[PDB]
Amino acid sequence: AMAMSSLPVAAVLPELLTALDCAPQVLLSAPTGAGKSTWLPLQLLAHPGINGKIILLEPRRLAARNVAQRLAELLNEKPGDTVGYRMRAQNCVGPNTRLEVVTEGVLTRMIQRDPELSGVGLVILDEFHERSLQADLALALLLDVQQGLRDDLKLLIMSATLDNDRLQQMLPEAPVVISEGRSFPVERRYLPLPAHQRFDDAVAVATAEMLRQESGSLLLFLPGVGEIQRVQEQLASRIGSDVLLCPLYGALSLNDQRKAILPAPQGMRKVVLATNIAETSLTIEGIRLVVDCAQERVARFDPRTGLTRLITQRVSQASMTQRAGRAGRLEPGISLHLIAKEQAERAAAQSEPEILQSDLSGLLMELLQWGCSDPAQMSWLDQPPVVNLLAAKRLLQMLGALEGERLSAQGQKMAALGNDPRLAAMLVSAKNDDEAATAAKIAAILEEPPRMGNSDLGVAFSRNQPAWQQRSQQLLKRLNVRGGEADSSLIAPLLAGAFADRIARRRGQDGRYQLANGMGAMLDANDALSRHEWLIAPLLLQGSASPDARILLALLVDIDELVQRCPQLVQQSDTVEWDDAQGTLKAWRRLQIGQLTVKVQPLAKPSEDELHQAMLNGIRDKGLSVLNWTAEAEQLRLRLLCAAKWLPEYDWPAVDDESLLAALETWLLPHMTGVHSLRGLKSLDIYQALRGLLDWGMQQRLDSELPAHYTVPTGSRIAIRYHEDNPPALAVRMQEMFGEATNPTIAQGRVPLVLELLSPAQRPLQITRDLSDFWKGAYREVQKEMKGRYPKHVWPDDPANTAPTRRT
Structure with a gap:
């Protein structure tokens, strides 16, 4: 035509x-x-x-x-x-x-x-x-x-x-x-891969078997280039002479991309080995067979490490179906999914959008510059996850980009650059044009890392690669800086600011590092950089969920210079506590860079604000148990727990162990005036301190709605026994409840007291929280035994209405 x-x-x-x-x-x-x-x-x-x-x-x-x-x-x-x-x-x-x-x-x-x-x-x-x-x-x-x-x-x-x-x-x-074209029916088959076979062997065996039973060219979906290469090699020994193997990735041979997309030559059939770019974006022709490994490779942000990793995961039902339909563009086709059918049926219906799995520091920087104070104000298909927004906020704080809930002065400059926020922060922190040019080159490198296996960032820096140079010039233009001379001696403090959490210290063995954010970082034991104790590692490859990562690009730093150059890196933390294991007083001062202990020293004669603080840290070490927890203090703590359950319309303070340990400065420290020894820790009025968490109104509310004592009909004041889980209980002699028709209640009438009804000898007769049922029910059987073991008491036939003997 x-x-x-x-x-x-x-x-x-x-x-x-x-x-x-x-x-x-x-x-x-x-x-x-x-x-x-x-x-x-x-x-x-x-x-x-x-x-x-x-x-x-x-x-x-x-x-x-x-x-x-x-x-x-x-x-x-x-x-x-x-x-x-x-x-x-x-x-x-x-x-x-x-x-x-x-x-x-x-x-x-x-x-x-x-x-x-x-x-x-x-x-x-x-x-x-x-x-x-x-x-x-x-x-x-x-x-x-x-x-x-x-x-x-x-x-x-x-x-x-x-x-x-x-x-x-x-x-x-x-x-x-x-707009839709002809989409042919595709038969869907399932085949789990055995646990005792490698992935690449298993896929090749399944694929060769499809070629043997079925007619046509075949499209094989794999997670990435490496898997494409390995399956290709395994496939090569298991296929006939008529089968042409055609890998398909962007980094390929121009015409190899065409050989894969274009129909197989006459007399032959092709196997196209592709990533999910063939799923929707690319049209491969001549296909009526699909083999779908059902495994994707996606970027995943880890809020605890601040790192993004490539993980492999199950593909969703929607994309498994989209993949199957790639066998149905030409004629009726066949799709084989390399998982069991029941696992396919339990896969997520839809794919996870990138906004749910990624670093949001850039996005947050965009929304702030856009004038958005909270991401929810915008219209998303999927709202950004709270956890990752919080991690983003914290990072922007570290970088000095935030002033309250808005962008700081430096934050506005960072937003203008439009760069990755850590890199933008680095650029904007340059104090002169030489630091600027240094920052710009570092930034161009971290955006487009070298593709050899060299870990020293100082090596890449010294290379004068033309594309990096181009990017540097572009960044300096945006930064409005020109004419500076880059110098490697200016790198470490620039990095220190934007990657402080990725400062690395050697831990016991060569190659093993811990980062300031507490995670583990690994370098090859025979790497030039693993000859040094202190590094900054901006580029990190996290293996997976385990807070351990490989160091890809790093700079060696003399830590003494760096801490001197950047004093804000180091925070001070004193600790005083009693070591029961050895019966001695432990008192040290720790200088730390994040989670990295830099120095530990004996505590010099401390100020008293220092001492109190050091004791709080000791309590964090030893637990709240070192304080004096009277029955009354503990009951108060339990009453606070119960109020939050039964009276949740009010703002009761959290009083779980971790909230308390975290807030010692707020609830406990104010009362520590005159405490000069670990001995005085047991003297703190824990009840008063906890009660201090409530304003006057709430104190009155708690005393009234969850009272320590209940006044029974006789006028006696009986202690209520609170519990974190069990109903509040009241142990009371049955005789004292005469005249009460209705089971007692607290918490604005919401919670009946469990009555532990006792005899004159304080012996448990009945446990009930339906006092009205008791008078009508089991009481007539209790009344006869009380007429037998204590005939000297009046045990009335109508206790609900018998006038209480007024004690007071």
């Missing part, structure tokens, strides 16, 4: 224009090779309904210039001209363009600088199904721009997956526009 086929996106275009000129957001769904990226933009550009410029966000650099260059050929122009692109370290735009194809956070920069996006009428978020943090952040900003003046700014969200329905739950007013 000579006249090309009108792409399927053409057939859906009129529906799109109608929705485009009707709603503030339009959602478009269409297969990836349908031309939604490489065609549709121009026709929205030529459409008079759209006013001005159109921005097209792409998830990665490689995608972005494919779209811009390919779409330029349609207008018979080269790019930069009418169709342009922007990247993190390159710009291609004239006085000319109307369609810009951006990536690598560029869209975020544009909106930050021009929050009304002047001249722009339509923004397109492509490959939205990948749920990048970048595209989520773009979506949130753009929805806020649209609630300002810009109620004319239209928005096209393009997804390659059929339905995306947590998106209309966010946007019910949004027209869904669906």
Whole structure:
């Protein structure tokens, strides 16, 4: 045929224009090779309904210039001209363009600088199904721009997956526009891999068996390049002469990418070994068999280490289904999933969005600069996790970016750079232009690390790699600094500020380090740097959930210089306590950098504010048990626990062991005047100190609603026995409860007392919290025995109404 086929996106275009000129957001769904990226933009550009410029966000650099260059050929122009692109370290735009194809956070920069996006009428978020943090952040900003003046700014969200329905739950007013092609049925099979076989052998065996039983070319999904290589080797010995093996990763041989995408040559079949880029973004042709290992490799932020790691995990049902459908574009196909069916049925329904698994220090920095005081104010498909926002806040504090709940003066400069916050912090902390140039080079290195196996950051620094140089110049421009001379002697204090938690000290054996944040860091025992005791390790590869990581890039520091240069790194902590194990007084001063003990020394004659503080730390060592816990103090503590359960509408203080240990400075220290010895620790009035946690009102409330004593009908004051878990109990002679028809209660009438009803001899007759039932029930059997063992007492037939003998 000579006249090309009108792409399927053409057939859906009129529906799109109608929705485009009707709603503030339009959602478009269409297969990836349908031309939604490489065609549709121009026709929205030529459409008079759209006013001005159109921005097209792409998830990665490689995608972005494919779209811009390919779409330029349609207008018979080269790019930069009418169709342009922007990247993190390159710009291609004239006085000319109307369609810009951006990536690598560029869209975020544009909106930050021009929050009304002047001249722009339509923004397109492509490959939205990948749920990048970048595209989520773009979506949130753009929805806020649209609630300002810009109620004319239209928005096209393009997804390659059929339905995306947590998106209309966010946007019910949004027209869904669906382009779909022929999708053939795919039979789904399951096969767990045996525990006694390697992954690569097991996958190769399963795959060779599929080739043996079934006809066609085969697409094999694997977690990454390494697995692709290893399975390929194992496959090579188990396949026939007609089977052509075709790996598929970005780092490949240009034509090897084509050999994998294009149909197998005549007479032969192909096995395409790919990562999940083949799942939605890439169209591999000639495929009717899929083998799905069902295992992804994803970035995971660890709030306890502040590190991001690559973990491997089970793929979701939605992506297993998307993977299976890759066997159904040509003809009816077959998909084999390398897990048991029941495990597939229990996999998460949907994939986890990047915003839930990543470092949010950059995002938080963006929202603050955007003017957002709390991330919840924005509209997210998925709200940022509280735990990671807190970790982000803490990091920004460490970097000095925050002033209360807003950006500090330095924080605003960091936000202007647009950089990773730790790296931005480093740049902004430079005190002169030589420190600036040093910081810029370090930053360009940490953004694009060397790809040899060299751990010394001073080595990379001394290299004059041209791409690093380019990035440095760009960062200095943003920083508004020029003409300084970089110097390696200026590196350590710059690093110290932005990576203080990653200062590393050698621990007992060469190669074993502990970081200031307390975690373990490993370097090869035969590494030049592992000859030294103190390092700063900005780049770390965490093995997995275990707080242990490999050191990838590090700098050697003389710790004495560093602490002298940066005194704020070192905090002081005194401890006084009694060692029962050896019957001696322990009293030391510890200088520490984070969790790293730098020096321990005998405590010199301390001030008294110092001594009291040192004793608090000793209590943290030995536990609250060293204080004097009277029955009364403990009962108070228990009453506070019970109040929080039974009277939760009030703000009762936490009084669990850890809250108390954590707050010693607030509740215990004020009372430590005149305590000059460990002996005096037992003299502190623990009851009064705990009671001090309550204002006058709450003290009255607690004394009234959870009273220490209950007054019974005789006028006697009987102690209530509180307990962390059991109902409050009241041990009382039965005779004293005469005249009371209703079981006693405390806590605003919410909690009946468990009555331990006793005989004259203080012997338990009945345990009840339904006193009314007791009088009518078991009492008549108790009355006869009380008429037998104590005939000298009156045991009335109607105790509920018998006048109480007034004691008082």
